[PDB]
Design a protein around this ligand. Structure first.
Ligand SMILES: [Mg+2]
Ligand SMILES: [Mg+2]
Ligand SMILES: [Mg+2]
Ligand SMILES: [Mg+2]
Ligand SMILES: [Mg+2]
Ligand SMILES: [Mg+2]
Ligand SMILES: [Mg+2]
Ligand SMILES: [Mg+2]
Ligand SMILES: [Mg+2]
Ligand SMILES: [Mg+2]
Ligand SMILES: [Mg+2]
Ligand SMILES: [Mg+2]
Ligand SMILES: [Mg+2]
Ligand SMILES: [Mg+2]
Ligand SMILES: [Mg+2]
Ligand SMILES: [Mg+2]
Ligand SMILES: [Mg+2]
Ligand SMILES: [Mg+2]
Ligand SMILES: [Mg+2]
Ligand SMILES: [Mg+2]
Ligand SMILES: [Mg+2]
Ligand SMILES: [Mg+2]
Ligand SMILES: [Mg+2]
Ligand SMILES: [Mg+2]
Ligand SMILES: [Mg+2]
Ligand SMILES: [Mg+2]
Ligand SMILES: [Mg+2]
Ligand SMILES: [Mg+2]
Ligand SMILES: [Mg+2]
Ligand SMILES: [Mg+2]
Ligand SMILES: [Mg+2]
Ligand SMILES: [Mg+2]
Ligand SMILES: [Mg+2]
Ligand SMILES: [Mg+2]
Ligand SMILES: [Mg+2]
Ligand SMILES: [Mg+2]
Ligand SMILES: [Mg+2]
Lengths: 199, 153, 394
RNA sequence: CGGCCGGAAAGGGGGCCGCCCUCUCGCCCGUCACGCACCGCACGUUCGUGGGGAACCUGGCGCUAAACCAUUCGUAGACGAC
RNA sequence: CCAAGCGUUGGAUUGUUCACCCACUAAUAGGGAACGUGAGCUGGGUUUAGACCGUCGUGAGACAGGUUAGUUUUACCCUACU
RNA sequence: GUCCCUACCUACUAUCCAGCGAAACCACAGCCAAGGGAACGGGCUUGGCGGAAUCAGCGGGGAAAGAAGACCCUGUUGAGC
RNA sequence: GGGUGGAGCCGCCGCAGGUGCAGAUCUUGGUGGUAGUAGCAAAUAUUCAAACGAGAACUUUGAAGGCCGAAGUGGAGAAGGG
RNA sequence: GCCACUUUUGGUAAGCAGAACUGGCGCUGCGGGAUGAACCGAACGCCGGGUUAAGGCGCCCGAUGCCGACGCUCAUCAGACC
């Protein structure tokens, strides 16, 4: 009932375009690890566009101005809001449906993340072109938490490595079980092979 | 005479009316909204504390330019004022309605004020004298007060 | 058209919401960054401002025109009783910041610290921490407490201990003490919590936190001055005498076509009582308090090694509008923020300070303790009556 | 039903050692019929002891607080606020 | 070249914008925001009604000619800002 | 103290309260950047965004208010000379 | 249809007009927001007790402290008022 | 009166002034050109179904969520529709 998308390797607006329409269609989308979002073009052009966004500012009172959110999750939230019709109730309901995180927090580390190949940098860029990491751009422009998110992601990669080793040895036990019991599940296996589940 | 809403039980409800009372409508409406839900003895000690500036009337609707006070945080409002003759006219009216419940044969100490209503009376004029030989009006704003008390346990 | 003669801008936009501050005691926006090589130490303290005094000292800086000459310098005295540690707070680092993990208080908490949890100590029946203090004298309770000290050892990064002032030693009217989280910068989380819980519930004086001849930063709200105009708040130029609608103003608010008034325009509002943080105040002296020895009290705080008098830091007739400084104090170079009797948060410097004006050793010669309630001309009572002789009162 | 651990980024209704109980019922093929067969006809089938609100309720282990006004201070103050 | 972060002044003359000179300076750069800025001020000049002069007109009077004296009104509304 | 360079004290206000209490003004009304537009928007378009009710000031903006421009022109409209 | 009201009213065929309002800085009358707002600030100043009284900062009496200061906030006229 | 394809006069030029042919706007909505008197399509009674024009089809925003075709293009100022 909830899409959990990974953010690593996805282009910024090219991911936000699928996410915007998918949230207007009533899904609940959690785009996680948004410091791994790529942006096409090289890093200096991308941070010049973001510093131009910083210079654009309400003159008489910048407290009313464009709130330049520096966190990567909220840069991606602002670009989904740019693609959504947020001045009305259905666009605001869409922004209530969307949740966006930096790193992978504990509600969603224990779940499996989806990927969108239609927004993914290994597909929609030529391999010789330059790209730019949104997390390093956001740290470069005033987000303060690259180091703590990096250490927390190192911790969750370790704990997921422990989980993956145990899942591997479980599935080794499963296949040794199948080879020990194939003589008495052979009549159940071949009726699956004739219907094309198991060859 | 003809009141706005009749009481839901006429047998245990006393009534009181006053027309053309030379007190300000905006000061009287909001002390009536202050004492609208109260018990009768609680309402009388409220109005006498309003006269003695110990508890205020929160000005909620007729709100502009009246400054703040600290005694209105117990009303949940930042503004308040202590209108003494506006307290005193409807304090006389509480004494009238209490006398009427005594005349009708009711339990005085069980009277919750249910209905209270302040209307605008016909304005009566005076003159003021302005610059450059002009005349502007100096209108009074009296009010009509209407009040119904009902026995409740 | 442009501005005819260019002139620099009145005031600073860095301190811009010039409002009455929400908090009375100044808070520390940043402690020094801890490194695990140091021993553990508190990185702040909290003392109250008493008054102002001269000093006289010989300056040994090579190359100045005041080398080995003898200046006078204005100093400030912050009466600084030892603070009582009451609880430790842990913090975990999050991608959203640094949130508090598990606050753990002591068993016995002094009533002057208990007063802080009450807007009205009179009408309350003083019930605070009474269900909590039972968690120390039962076995299931202190198993729970060893559990969350073990959790704070595992999951926290910075550890800061609650400490309050000891108000019953001060000449002030109030009794309600001030509580403060002071960051324990030093070794690891293990050694940090060990130090914190072993000095839990007991005192800590000034000299364990600060050393003499050390640049510190002073934090506090300023002396409030009320709702004041642009001339007395923003120091704009007074318009000339001939002005029709009053002269102590700003003439042109803003241009036409930016159809608002910018936030940078100097306008009339609250002046004073702003939170401020000044840096690099040098401690000249950390005075010992009044204490008893062999029956009589030893008092000579303002005695130096070049004076050897018997006078204390208290002037004649006490500090004006404050009282008598009896226990420990720090004596700082120049002025600090806030009025008399004002809570005034001290802390360490974030900067490393390798320059000789921050590294000047301080030998005081004379602390001018004459009366501040007028033009005092005598250092002490004995000198005054020995100069004036017998009066008619004797 | 008792004990052991596993969680802190926004903490796991998980795993394990026995227990008195009780089962060859759970699953896959078959034998046997029965269950309003409501007479062609829609929102059926769940997460649902769902979120929030009232009194009817019967027990057990537990708790009897602060805030605001008013008075005072004057480190504060146009009035509030502090 | 990157670069407007930070400065770019005090005065004599003139109503001056301009101009010129004395003096310090690190430098005395140029400008915009309804040729910023009159419910912000001042009212020196232009630009009412009084007057004197020169020229023009027979005259009433005219002068991008000079001179002198000549009422500068209101915010308590909404926004903005403090 | 005209100014460098402002500071402080007093009276009467303004502030708050008890009583009494108007007027000017008002299409609906009020947050901005840009676009186009009757060539300078509060409304339209695209964005930025937006949180009750309010108090003391303030003079940016409402091309703020008053007064059917007094300057210029048109009038087969006049008057003083 | 319902309510209120308490003495006249309509349909059709012809006729006759002082016959249909959103505006005219329209005319007359009423009523809003502003708004319990601006303000009730020229000429030094009031205080205590008592009396009448339903009620007193404002009336009256006594005491005190002030002012006008003989070109007066004094004692009398003329015009005007009636 | 104004605008526009093309012809054309004055002026360096103009969202300038002046003509000729025809179409428009004024008097006119509707789809497109984001926005818009004049441009592109198209002229209108109230509606149901189908289909188009001009313009479009990442998302706002209906429609390319084609396994679209062939190339060019790196911008520390990319480019993007009378
Ligand atoms: Mg209101
Ligand atoms: Mg107001
Ligand atoms: Mg008058
Ligand atoms: Mg007159
Ligand atoms: Mg300049
Ligand atoms: Mg003047
Ligand atoms: Mg002194
Ligand atoms: Mg001069
Ligand atoms: Mg100008
Ligand atoms: Mg003006
Ligand atoms: Mg102006
Ligand atoms: Mg002049
Ligand atoms: Mg002649
Ligand atoms: Mg006012
Ligand atoms: Mg009043
Ligand atoms: Mg609209
Ligand atoms: Mg204005
Ligand atoms: Mg005007
Ligand atoms: Mg006229
Ligand atoms: Mg005209
Ligand atoms: Mg003609
Ligand atoms: Mg004539
Ligand atoms: Mg009749
Ligand atoms: Mg007729
Ligand atoms: Mg009408
Ligand atoms: Mg009519
Ligand atoms: Mg007023
Ligand atoms: Mg007389
Ligand atoms: Mg007389
Ligand atoms: Mg033309
Ligand atoms: Mg036509
Ligand atoms: Mg058309
Ligand atoms: Mg366009
Ligand atoms: Mg066409
Ligand atoms: Mg064509
Ligand atoms: Mg159709
Ligand atoms: Mg489109």
């Amino acid at each position: 009932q909830v899409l959990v998308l990974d953010g690593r390797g996805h282009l910024l607006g090219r991911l936000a375009a699928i996410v915007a329409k998918q949230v207007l269609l009533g899904r609940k989308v959690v785009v996680v690890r948004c410091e791994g979002i790529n942006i096409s073009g090289n890093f200096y052009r991308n941070k010049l566009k973001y510093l131009a966004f910083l210079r654009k500012r309400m003159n008489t009172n910048p407290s009313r101005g464009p709130y330049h959110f520096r966190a990567p999750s909220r840069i991606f939230w602002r670009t989904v809001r740019g693609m959504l019709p947020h001045k009305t109730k259905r666009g605001q309901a869409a922004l209530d449906r969307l949740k966006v995180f930096d790193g992978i927090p504990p509600p969603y580390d224990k779940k499996k993340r989806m990927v969108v190949p239609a927004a993914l940098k290994v597909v929609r860029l030529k391999p010789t072109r330059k790209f730019a990491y949104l997390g390093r751009l956001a740290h470069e422009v005033g987000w303060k938490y690259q180091a703590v998110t990096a250490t927390l992601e190192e911790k969750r990669k370790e704990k997921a490595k422990i989980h993956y080793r145990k899942k591997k040895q479980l599935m080794r036990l499963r296949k040794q079980a199948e080879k020990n019991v194939e003589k008495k599940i052979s009549k159940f296996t071949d009726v699956l092979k004739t219907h094309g589940l198991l060859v | 005479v003809r009141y706005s809403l009749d009481p839901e039980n006429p047998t245990k409800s006393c009534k009181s009316r006053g027309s053309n009372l030379r007190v300000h409508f905006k000061n009287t409406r909001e002390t009536a909204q202050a004492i609208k839900g109260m018990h009768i003895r609680k309402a009388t000690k409220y109005l006498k504390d309003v006269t003695l500036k110990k508890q205020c009337v929160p000005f909620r609707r007729y709100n502009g330019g009246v400054g703040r006070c600290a005694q209105a945080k117990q009303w949940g409002w930042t503004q308040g004022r202590w209108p003494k003759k506006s307290a005193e006219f409807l304090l006389h009216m509480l004494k009238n309605a209490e006398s009427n419940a005594e005349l009708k044969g009711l339990d005085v100490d069980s009277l919750v004020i249910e209905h209270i209503q302040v209307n605008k009376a016909p304005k009566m004029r005076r003159r003021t004298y302005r610059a450059h030989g002009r005349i502007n009006p100096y209108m009074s704003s009296p009010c009509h007060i209407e009040m119904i008390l009902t026995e409740k346990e | 058209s442009h501005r005819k003669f260019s002139a620099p801008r009145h005031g600073s936009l860095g301190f811009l919401p010039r409002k009455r501050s929400s908090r009375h005691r100044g808070k520390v926006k940043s402690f020094p960054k801890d490194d695990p090589s140091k021993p553990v130490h508190l990185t702040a303290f909290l003392g109250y401002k008493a008054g102002m005094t001269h000093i006289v000292r010989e300056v040994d800086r090579p190359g100045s025109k005041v080398n080995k000459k003898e200046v006078v310098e204005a100093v400030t005295i912050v009466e600084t009783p030892p603070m009582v540690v009451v609880g430790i707070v842990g913090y975990v680092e999050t991608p959203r910041g640094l949130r508090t993990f598990k606050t753990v208080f002591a068993e016995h908490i002094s009533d002057e610290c208990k007063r802080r949890f009450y807007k009205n100590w009179h009408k309350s029946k003083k019930k605070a921490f009474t269900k909590y203090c039972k968690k120390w004298q039962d076995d299931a309770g202190k198993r729970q407490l060893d559990k969350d000290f073990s959790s704070m050892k595992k999951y926290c990064q910075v550890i800061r201990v609650l400490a309050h002032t000891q108000m019953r030693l001060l000449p002030l009217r109030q009794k309600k003490a001030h509580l403060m989280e002071i960051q324990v910068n030093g070794g690891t989380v293990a050694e940090k919590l060990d130090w914190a819980r072993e000095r839990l519930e007991q005192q800590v004086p000034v000299s364990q936190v600060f050393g003499q001849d050390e640049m510190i930063d002073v934090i506090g709200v300023t002396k409030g001055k009320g709702y004041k105009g642009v001339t007395s708040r923003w120091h704009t130029k007074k318009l000339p005498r001939k002005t029709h609608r009053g002269l102590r103003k700003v003439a042109c608010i803003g241009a036409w076509h930016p159809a608002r008034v910018a936030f940078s325009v100097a306008r009339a509002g609250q002046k004073g009582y702003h939170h401020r943080t000044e840096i690099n105040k040098k401690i000249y002296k950390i005075g010992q308090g009044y204490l008893i020895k062999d029956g009589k009290l030893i008092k000579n705080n303002a005695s130096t090694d070049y004076d050897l008098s018997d006078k204390s830091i208290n002037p004649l007739g006490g500090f004006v509008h404050y009282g008598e400084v009896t226990n420990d104090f720090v004596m700082l170079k120049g002025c600090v923020v806030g009025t008399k009797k004002r809570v005034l948060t001290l802390r360490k410097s974030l900067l490393v300070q390798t320059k000789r004006r921050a590294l000047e050793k301080i030998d005081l010669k004379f602390i001018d303790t004459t009366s501040k309630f007028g033009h005092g001309r005598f250092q002490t009572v004995e000198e005054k009556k020995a100069f004036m002789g017998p009066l008619k009162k004797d």
